[PDB]
Design an enzyme around this catalytic site. Structure first.
Site, PDB file in Angstrom:
ATOM      1  N   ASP A 166      26.297 -64.952 -25.120  1.00 21.00           N
ATOM      2  CA  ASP A 166      25.859 -64.890 -23.715  1.00 21.00           C
ATOM      3  C   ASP A 166      24.681 -65.855 -23.483  1.00 21.00           C
ATOM      4  O   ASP A 166      23.604 -65.446 -23.013  1.00 21.00           O
ATOM      5  CB  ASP A 166      25.442 -63.457 -23.399  1.00 21.00           C
ATOM      6  CG  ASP A 166      25.089 -63.244 -21.912  1.00 21.00           C
ATOM      7  OD1 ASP A 166      25.738 -63.856 -21.033  1.00 21.00           O
ATOM      8  OD2 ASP A 166      24.175 -62.419 -21.635  1.00 21.00           O
ATOM      9  N   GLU A 402      24.608 -58.601 -33.414  1.00 21.63           N
ATOM     10  CA  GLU A 402      25.839 -57.936 -32.937  1.00 21.63           C
ATOM     11  C   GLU A 402      27.160 -58.397 -33.582  1.00 21.63           C
ATOM     12  O   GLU A 402      28.183 -58.631 -32.893  1.00 21.63           O
ATOM     13  CB  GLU A 402      25.952 -58.063 -31.391  1.00 21.63           C
ATOM     14  CG  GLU A 402      24.697 -57.532 -30.679  1.00 21.63           C
ATOM     15  CD  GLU A 402      24.914 -57.299 -29.195  1.00 21.63           C
ATOM     16  OE1 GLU A 402      25.886 -57.903 -28.636  1.00 21.63           O
ATOM     17  OE2 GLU A 402      24.126 -56.515 -28.607  1.00 21.63           O
ATOM     18  N   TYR A 458      22.086 -50.506 -24.273  1.00 21.24           N
ATOM     19  CA  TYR A 458      22.121 -50.685 -22.812  1.00 21.24           C
ATOM     20  C   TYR A 458      22.616 -49.403 -22.111  1.00 21.24           C
ATOM     21  O   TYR A 458      23.420 -49.432 -21.162  1.00 21.24           O
ATOM     22  CB  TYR A 458      23.006 -51.858 -22.447  1.00 21.24           C
ATOM     23  CG  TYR A 458      22.369 -53.177 -22.838  1.00 21.24           C
ATOM     24  CD1 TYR A 458      21.450 -53.788 -21.983  1.00 21.24           C
ATOM     25  CD2 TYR A 458      22.634 -53.769 -24.056  1.00 21.24           C
ATOM     26  CE1 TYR A 458      20.835 -54.997 -22.341  1.00 21.24           C
ATOM     27  CE2 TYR A 458      22.032 -54.995 -24.418  1.00 21.24           C
ATOM     28  CZ  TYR A 458      21.133 -55.592 -23.554  1.00 21.24           C
ATOM     29  OH  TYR A 458      20.485 -56.792 -23.871  1.00 21.24           O
ATOM     30  N   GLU A 496      16.874 -54.962 -28.098  1.00 19.07           N
ATOM     31  CA  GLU A 496      17.312 -55.278 -26.721  1.00 19.07           C
ATOM     32  C   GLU A 496      17.482 -53.993 -25.944  1.00 19.07           C
ATOM     33  O   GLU A 496      18.004 -53.011 -26.449  1.00 19.07           O
ATOM     34  CB  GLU A 496      18.659 -56.036 -26.664  1.00 19.07           C
ATOM     35  CG  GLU A 496      18.594 -57.425 -27.332  1.00 19.07           C
ATOM     36  CD  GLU A 496      19.858 -58.259 -27.155  1.00 19.07           C
ATOM     37  OE1 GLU A 496      20.648 -57.971 -26.193  1.00 19.07           O
ATOM     38  OE2 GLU A 496      20.046 -59.209 -27.972  1.00 19.07           O
TER      39      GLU A 496
HETATM   40  O1  LIG Z   1      24.640 -58.603 -22.111  1.00 20.80           O
HETATM   41  C1  LIG Z   1      23.462 -59.030 -22.348  1.00 20.80           C
HETATM   42  O2  LIG Z   1      22.608 -59.256 -21.466  1.00 20.80           O
HETATM   43  C2  LIG Z   1      23.102 -59.240 -23.790  1.00 20.80           C
HETATM   44  N1  LIG Z   1      24.077 -58.471 -24.610  1.00 20.80           N
HETATM   45  C3  LIG Z   1      23.692 -58.493 -26.023  1.00 20.80           C
HETATM   46  C4  LIG Z   1      23.326 -59.864 -26.563  1.00 20.80           C
HETATM   47  O3  LIG Z   1      22.717 -59.757 -27.834  1.00 20.80           O
HETATM   48  C5  LIG Z   1      22.499 -60.699 -25.645  1.00 20.80           C
HETATM   49  O4  LIG Z   1      22.477 -62.038 -26.082  1.00 20.80           O
HETATM   50  C6  LIG Z   1      23.077 -60.675 -24.283  1.00 20.80           C
HETATM   51  O5  LIG Z   1      22.359 -61.540 -23.384  1.00 20.80           O
END
Ligand SMILES: O=C(O)[C@H]1NC[C@H](O)[C@@H](O)[C@@H]1O
Ligand SMILES: O=C(O)[C@H]1NC[C@H](O)[C@@H](O)[C@@H]1O
Lengths: 581, 578
Positions: A166, A402, A458, A496
């Site tokens: 991403d 990931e 998330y 994250e």
């Molecule tokens: O979906 C997102 O915002 C993030 N998902 C997990 C990734 O490791 C990130 O690089 C990505 O930007």
């Protein structure tokens, strides 16, 4: 390695000339440059800044989105004094892979777009004359090199990058470029490791040179005064009343490594280092024997127009914003950054988790390409650790982001990566990687390889977002209860968590994408984090909005920044500032 | 001048080393540095990027808005082989004024924040050792140096810049810094002037050196082949079948200037130049004897975070945007830009109106000192920039008072000075505000062509009164037409603040649609008068200003946003200028 990773310096023995500026540049859609003499000069170039990513200068789609072979050229005058020295071209990076030519001759090739490329031009350099460098670069994505992806072929054979990651596929000469001259016998590498002894400290070292003459090592304090000196390529520097490098309160010594002949000096290398220890004790991360809780962000090398191009101004603004939030740490998501970022973290007392570009490795470890991928991954890990090990800021290595981790195949793959990393780090500092949710506590086979565990989660964005946020919180607590029950006795760091947030989108009650929902999401995550003793850090995704591939999920890149792309705070930035104070 | 303006190059005779990077930096609000020995090293510095403006790095108001004395330091290793050379520190600029120290010794001072500063460190440099540079800089504004303004003192002693101009008071070391080594006898200056003779051309030249040895001048074509050679510090190069530098279709020769003694070459300077002529004939601007209509913008050196800091990336994006609009010209509003902008214009075939920072002079014993500053900046600009084929005109003011006899006498001195410094005697102009009414202005006769800044439809009869604005604009232009001056008129500013994403039907002031309608109305007026010969819109891109009730995060009259993306009106220019 067959070259040195040491940052270039200028003194009586070592010379350096910047090649940054406007280079010549040409796209090669038909892959005919090497068939057509381009290594001796490009036939119809345009101008391209270096350092920079090339993509965002242009006003047409096909040039911005170019995928394939493309070329850079420049000329430079070499002083006659450099004659018969070991003369190298040093690229901060070449993104993603390339071949370096000098004066029409092939010098070296490199795979991996985020670490230095060293090209030995000693036998083809023309001292006291104008010299030429030409680089053939390619920015396609595949499954045998990092970061992974695919290359699609459209109409007329026009290629398009298809990342499995991403972030936008920026490429080119994104970092500074030098030509340098070294003595024929030189310091090629060195490593330091630290031990604290009450109020004193030991700096343990090893030096690798390209010859057999004696080595002397000196340590100077911040004022340049001598505090320790020893002889030999391996030794211990004893430092009385050592001034330790501390979180957000740096102190740097200078190590000075001399090769001697007489009577006389053959080479001198100098670098700032900081005396500090990091270790994991139970669920705690200890810095100089005191627990530290990590507070900060994942970042990117990303800025308007320049793309991933290096500029000290971006470093300065970003560190002033980090300090204002009361952060102490960032991860170099998802590739090693320009060396200058670490130099500056050393000065500012920031902690870094240094990450290799092992991103894009899960569908959507059994393909016949995997052994080649492993070789690439291990090579990039070797280069990263060799380049970055002597920064006091670097306190951990992240070896993946990931991947798939629930098969025996994946365990065997990562066992090899971690084993290699261990051999390269003289300090044996913590190794980790960031796990996605698919790596369930019941299924994951790779978390035991880690000194501490990093989770990307998330809950409240991709899972049960918006009106379902109370369900998200319960799902999150259910998973953390699962980890708790495993009684692993290791620290967990969230690497994250975040929500896309459009600056200026306000809503009462909040909605996904609004500034208010970013705040509410963060508060829910903090309540969960704070419920578990073994949580020992939080790095929010992301420090700033950044560019991605276009698509229906990305509104001009990724808007999970706490700051906008031009480095101004959204409402949630204050939430972090207050919590981290 | 007691130094050379020539851009630094590297060859057998001339060496250069970049000092760009992270410098040390310290604010000096109590003005204690010099009495405290800071020229020997700053006592509690922070890191500061160079080139950059310092202001927008910080997260606190007082550092962003700092006004007064502040200091920079760095260290550099000098190669031993530079011994026996003339060694200079070269700053692309020092904004606004400063004093350069090296190895603890005062070297030189300069006033004027947008042109090079040269400091001769030959007598204090230490070849084969680490050397130190410290610079004391001040960024206050006054009425005796350009650009003009005031300095306010807040009750606690804190200073705050008060510009008389509409751009933020960025300052610091905004351009690249080098240390260079020159031969003891060197090429210090040269000038070229062109004459077209059928298919051929003459390159007339003069060379100034720091000694008395013979000079040889060669001209190479774009493939490096010799096309002309002559001897002497003044001469004429004869070029057969010359390939002229054309608008948006450049061709660059290389001039090569050699100093020689009986045993060989002592110095070699080389630079790309373009053979072209510029002149005004009646209401036409002629480039290579053919009329050209100027199409483009006023710009700024302005970009997020960097401020006015130089970066080739900003040059590259801005020129790609300019070419996409089908522009051929920009004005360096309101100060000379980094040299690299002109080098790139030469390559891309863009026309430049090069502007000295004479802005903020509209409503004393300070006027004679201001005039001296204005003439010095003019001398430095012209000496630096005269050999760029892109530079086709000098702009010597932006919106001064022009209606008094006093102002005529002032500007007569500036224009006479400019003429003495420009070997090519190219067209000279300045930009007039509306207060310079055709019945009242005393200065437009000094100009070779007239540049007008107008805002009919923005500051005058905007919005629901735009029909009246158009009538007022035609009334003024009819007044100019009736004077039958037989000179070209160029509109150097016209525009509307426009917030990206503000849409309204029907349009309102500040919307993207109103920017389009305003531009269409202005074009209808421009096209009504034969003597109009160019249009440079204000501005290429949104840019930073002082904070205030009239500026919503700077000036939003850009056709592009600050991050270089087009508003709706950008396509209107693209289509018209095609
Ligand atoms: O979906 C997102 O915002 C993030 N998902 C997990 C990734 O490791 C990130 O690089 C990505 O930007
Ligand atoms: O008001 C404006 O927008 C403009 N007024 C005229 C000045 O020449 C400009 O510098 C200024 O930005």
């Amino acid at each position: 390695l067959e070259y040195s990773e040491l940052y270039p310096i200028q003194n009586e023995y070592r010379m350096m000339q910047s090649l940054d500026g406007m280079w010549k540049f040409q796209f090669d859609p038909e892959e005919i440059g090497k068939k057509s003499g381009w290594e001796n000069g490009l036939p119809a170039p345009v101008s391209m800044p270096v350092p920079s990513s090339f993509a965002d200068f242009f006003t047409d789609h096909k040039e911005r989105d170019y995928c394939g072979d493309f070329w850079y050229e420049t000329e430079f005058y070499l002083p006659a004094e450099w004659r018969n020295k070991k003369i190298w071209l040093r690229f901060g990076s070449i993104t993603h892979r390339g071949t370096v030519y000098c004066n029409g001759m092939e010098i070296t090739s490199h795979e991996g777009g985020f670490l230095p490329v060293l090209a030995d031009i000693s036998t083809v350099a023309k001292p006291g004359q104008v010299n030429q460098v030409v680089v053939k670069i390619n920015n396609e994505l595949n499954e045998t090199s990092l970061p992974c992806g695919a290359t699609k072929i459209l109409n007329n054979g026009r290629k398009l990058a298809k990342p499995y990651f991403d972030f936008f596929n920026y490429s080119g000469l994104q970092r500074s470029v030098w030509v340098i001259a070294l003595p024929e016998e030189s310091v090629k590498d060195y490593s330091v490791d630290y031990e604290l002894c009450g109020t004193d400290a030991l700096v343990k070292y090893e030096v690798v040179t390209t010859g057999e003459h004696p080595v002397i090592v000196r340590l100077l304090d911040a004022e340049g005064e001598l505090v320790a000196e020893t002889e030999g390529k391996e030794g211990i520097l004893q430092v009385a009343n050592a001034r330790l490098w501390e979180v957000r309160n740096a102190y740097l010594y200078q190590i000075v490594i001399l090769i001697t002949d007489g009577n006389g000096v053959l080479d001198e290398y100098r670098e700032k280092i900081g005396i500090r220890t990091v270790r994991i004790e139970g669920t705690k991360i200890l810095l100089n024997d005191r627990p530290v809780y990590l507070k900060g962000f994942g970042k990117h090398e990303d800025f308007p127009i320049l793309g991933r191009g290096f500029h000290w101004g971006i470093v300065k603004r970003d560190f002033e914003c980090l300090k204002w939030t009361n952060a102490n740490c960032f991860r170099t998501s998802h590739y090693p950054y320009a060396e200058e970022w670490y130099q500056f973290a050393d000065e500012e007392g920031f902690l870094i988790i240094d990450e290799v570009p092992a991103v894009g490795m899960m569908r959507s470890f059994e393909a016949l390409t995997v052994p080649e991928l492993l070789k690439s991954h291990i090579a990039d890990t070797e280069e990263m650790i060799t380049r970055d090990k002597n920064h006091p800021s670097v306190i951990a290595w992240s070896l993946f982001n990931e991947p798939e981790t629930i098969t025996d195949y994946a365990y065997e793959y990562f066992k090899e990566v971690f084993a290699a990393a261990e051999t390269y780090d003289f300090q044996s500092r913590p190794m980790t990687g960031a796990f996605e949710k698919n790596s369930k506590p019941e299924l994951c086979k790779c978390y035991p390889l880690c000194d501490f565990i990093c989770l990307n989660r998330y809950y409240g964005w991709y899972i049960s977002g918006g009106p379902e946020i109370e369900e998200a919180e319960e799902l999150f607590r259910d998973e953390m209860d699962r980890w708790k029950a495993k009684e692993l006795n290791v620290p967990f760091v969230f690497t994250e968590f975040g929500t896309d947030t459009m600056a200026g989108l306000h809503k009462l009650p909040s909605i996904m994408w609004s500034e208010e929902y970013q705040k509410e999401y963060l508060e829910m995550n903090f309540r969960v984090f704070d419920s578990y003793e073994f949580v020992q850090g939080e790095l929010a995704w992301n420090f700033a909005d950044f560019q991605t591939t276009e698509g229906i999920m990305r509104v001009d890149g990724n808007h999970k920044g706490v700051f906008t792309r031009d480095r101004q705070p959204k409402a949630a930035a204050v939430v972090f500032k207050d919590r981290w104070e």
